[PDB]
Amino acid sequence: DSYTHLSFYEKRELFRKKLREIEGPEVTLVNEVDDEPCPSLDFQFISQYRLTQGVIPPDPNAQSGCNCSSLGGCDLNNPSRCECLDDLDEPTHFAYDAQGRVRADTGAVIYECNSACSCSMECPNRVVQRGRTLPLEIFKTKEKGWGVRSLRFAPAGTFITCYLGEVITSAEAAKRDKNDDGITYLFDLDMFDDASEYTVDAQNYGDVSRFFNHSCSPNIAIYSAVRNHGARTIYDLAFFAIKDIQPLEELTFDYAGAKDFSPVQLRRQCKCGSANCRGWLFG
Ligand SMILES: Nc1ncnc2c1ncn2[C@@H]1O[C@H](CSCC[C@H](N)C(=O)O)[C@@H](O)[C@H]1O
Ligand SMILES: [Mg+2]
Ligand SMILES: [Zn+2]
Ligand SMILES: [Zn+2]
Ligand SMILES: [Zn+2]
Ligand SMILES: [Zn+2]
Numbered sequence: 107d108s109y110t111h112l113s114f115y116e117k118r119e120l121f122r123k124k125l126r127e128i129e130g131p132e133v134t135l136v137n138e139v140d141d142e143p144c145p146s147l148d149f150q151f152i153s154q155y156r157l158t159q160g161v162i163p164p165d166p167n168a169q170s171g172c173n174c175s176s177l178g179g180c181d182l183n184n185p186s187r188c189e190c191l192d193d194l195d196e197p198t199h200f201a202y203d204a205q206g207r208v209r210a211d212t213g214a215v216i217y218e219c220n221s222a223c224s225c226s227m228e229c230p231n232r233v234v235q236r237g238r239t240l241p242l243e244i245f246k247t248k249e250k251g252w253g254v255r256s257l258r259f260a261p262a263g264t265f266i267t268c269y270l271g272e273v274i275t276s277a278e279a280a281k282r283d284k285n286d287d288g289i290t291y292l293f294d295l296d297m298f299d300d301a302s303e304y305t306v307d308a309q310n311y312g313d314v315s316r317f318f319n320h321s322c323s324p325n326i327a328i329y330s331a332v333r334n335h336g337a338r339t340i341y342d343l344a345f346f347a348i349k350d351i352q353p354l355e356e357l358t359f360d361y362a363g364a365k366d367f368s369p370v371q372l373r374r375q376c377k378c379g380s381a382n383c384r385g386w387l388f389g
Pocket of ligand 1 (some may be wrong): 145169249250251252253281287288289290316318319320321333373376377378
């Protein structure tokens, strides 16, 4: 809707109310830049993928887990016991260190524990699952529309959040004609399969990561975090810090290979401002 019957204050207060109702750590809104009161009030905040028509989810009959049974669950210092890690090359280790941060030597694929595993929810191998721990702020950037930044220092390897949205088909992707601003592009789930062609559209439903902007010099990156032992047509898109992040520093990831820069079928350039900037065109 245009929401013309709602005033600057009413609209902004409604977006704030909407943020307050998110579970886990606080999310704030700020626009010290222009008088855009808030992002779309239609947008919904979800804690897991919102599946759609024709999207076959992983079969819980193909689920397997582990036998590690001790205090705190699975033992960082003994990864060769944990069946959840068998698909890794030697030397097997968990993706996470004693600090609960992704290791510098961890590859693109994180293998987390699942409902099938005997370990409790406090397992070191359920970091993504336990979700965001940092307070975040949706703020108005100078040239790139809305953006997100942390209120707290974040060491490299710190888990931030997952990219959520409607999971949709190629057929559905074509049916949605996307152009205007606050238009997200699609995030292919192509890390493993190609037949699936499942994609994540955060226009109407998503996470705070829906407001993360592109940088050619990013401070966060996507780790494909797999739990379910079926076919991997659907898996978690997990943001971790790849650089130490100052308070109030804009969270940016490299969209290339992940989030599209144009609608599936005039243009606006990259404003990340990095010296290495590739001048990537949007739309
Ligand atoms: N480096 C960059 N330069 C210019 N526009 C950018 C950008 N990174 C992201 N964007 C914009 O952000 C969109 C993705 S959705 C991210 C949040 C968006 N800024 C909003 O206001 O809701 C892109 O389609 C593009 O329009
Ligand atoms: Mg890709
Ligand atoms: Zn475990
Ligand atoms: Zn285990
Ligand atoms: Zn396990
Ligand atoms: Zn750039």
